[PDB]
Amino acid sequence: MRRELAIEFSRVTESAALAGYKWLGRGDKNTADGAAVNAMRIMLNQVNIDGTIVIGEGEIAEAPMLYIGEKVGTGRGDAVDIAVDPIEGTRMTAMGQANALAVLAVGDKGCFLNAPDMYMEKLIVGPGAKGTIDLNLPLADNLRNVAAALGKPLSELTVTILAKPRHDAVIAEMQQLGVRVFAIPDGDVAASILTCMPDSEVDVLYGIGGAPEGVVSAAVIRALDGDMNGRLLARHDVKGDNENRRIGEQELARCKAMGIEAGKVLRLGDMARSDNVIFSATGITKGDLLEGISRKGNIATTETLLIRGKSTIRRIQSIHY
Numbered sequence: 001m002r003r004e005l006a007i008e009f010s011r012v013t014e015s016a017a018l019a020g021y022k023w024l025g026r027g028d029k030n031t032a033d034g035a036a037v038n039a040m041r042i043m044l045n046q047v048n049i050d051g052t053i054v055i056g057e058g059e060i061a062e063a064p065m066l067y068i069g070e071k072v073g074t075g076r077g078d079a080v081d082i083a084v085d086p087i088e089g090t091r092m093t094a095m096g097q098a099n100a101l102a103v104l105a106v107g108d109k110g111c112f113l114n115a116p117d118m119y120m121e122k123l124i125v126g127p128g129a130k131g132t133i134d135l136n137l138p139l140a141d142n143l144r145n146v147a148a149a150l151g152k153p154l155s156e157l158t159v160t161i162l163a164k165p166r167h168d169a170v171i172a173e174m175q176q177l178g179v180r181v182f183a184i185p186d187g188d189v190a191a192s193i194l195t196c197m198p199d200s201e202v203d204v205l206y207g208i209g210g211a212p213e214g215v216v217s218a219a220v221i222r223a224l225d226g227d228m229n230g231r232l233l234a235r236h237d238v239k240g241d242n243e244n245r246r247i248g249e250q251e252l253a254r255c256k257a258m259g260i261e262a263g264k265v266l267r268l269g270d271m272a273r274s275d276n277v278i279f280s281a282t283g284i285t286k287g288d289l290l291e292g293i294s295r296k297g298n299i300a301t302t303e304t305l306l307i308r309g310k311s312t313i314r315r316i317q318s319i320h321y
């Protein structure tokens, strides 16, 4: 402990994944998510930590379970901060599609950036390009710098990015630069980790995705010794000026209340403040990062990726009876 808890945390994501898996292909993203949230909370509440949910399902008002500030754990052990994404890929789960997974990160008290559930522009790279990125520079400059750091031509650089209307221009810009663009339907947490996975052609993740998702990515990227910058963006500034403005202003007032500057570049250490992070993710369906659950009779299998910032990276293939 806390290294002794690594296995306990993997059981939490295995439970969440198996619970979400029950709703795979059932066309109900809310119910799938609720099942995974419930299973994750049940399991966390049997772990010997004094956990606070810092990234989660919503404020107490909108989220009955795993709400921001919720206390979880038996209360024995260390005060830790907890980031949960019980299903990354809820729509993908509802639709029986690839790349759904259950995600948890655990760190020292105060180790995760406290920021609103708003959008964040992200630029994420692996260890081979650590120190070569700066979101204050033009995208094309960053991409050139990263390719040079990795010792490959620009035309071979592979950038992953969410396939969303907000990204039309930048995707076209990158393709014109001659880079390879892997535009993904959802799931920038899992995709961010591919930057640190040698057998994935992905070199960089770039683009606007969920802020809490970006803070989880910062935690795991830090643990893997990659690099990331983020920049918080208000809703109307990413979707267009229309109730976006209303949502946007709540977000900016929240940034101030939490003492965060929106639109300012966040360095890796601004989002994940220490190396003492345990990250666990378990596949629901097969994706680029993890195998999916299988079931034959009364036996089910899961694969879990378990990463500890202090230290080896583990892939745990379990058979459950």
Ligand SMILES: O=P(O)(O)OC[C@H]1O[C@](O)(COP(=O)(O)O)[C@@H](O)[C@@H]1O
Binding pocket: 087, 088, 089, 090, 091, 092, 162, 164, 185, 186, 187, 188, 189, 209, 210, 211, 213, 214
């Ligand atoms: O769908 P949006 O509004 O582009 O939000 C992007 C965020 O949603 C995700 O793609 C997850 O999708 P789901 O919410 O369906 O689970 C994240 O990986 C990402 O950060």
Ligand SMILES: [Ca+2]
Binding pocket: 033, 057, 085, 086, 087
């Ligand atoms: Ca959720």
Ligand SMILES: [Ca+2]
Binding pocket: 085, 087, 088, 089, 210, 213
């Ligand atoms: Ca999410």
Ligand SMILES: [Cl-]
Binding pocket: 164, 165, 166, 167, 239
């Ligand atoms: Cl969009």
Ligand SMILES: [Mg+2]
Binding pocket: none
């Ligand atoms: Mg969405």
Ligand SMILES: [Mg+2]
Binding pocket: 194, 195, 196, 197, 198, 199, 200, 201, 202, 203
């Ligand atoms: Mg890779």
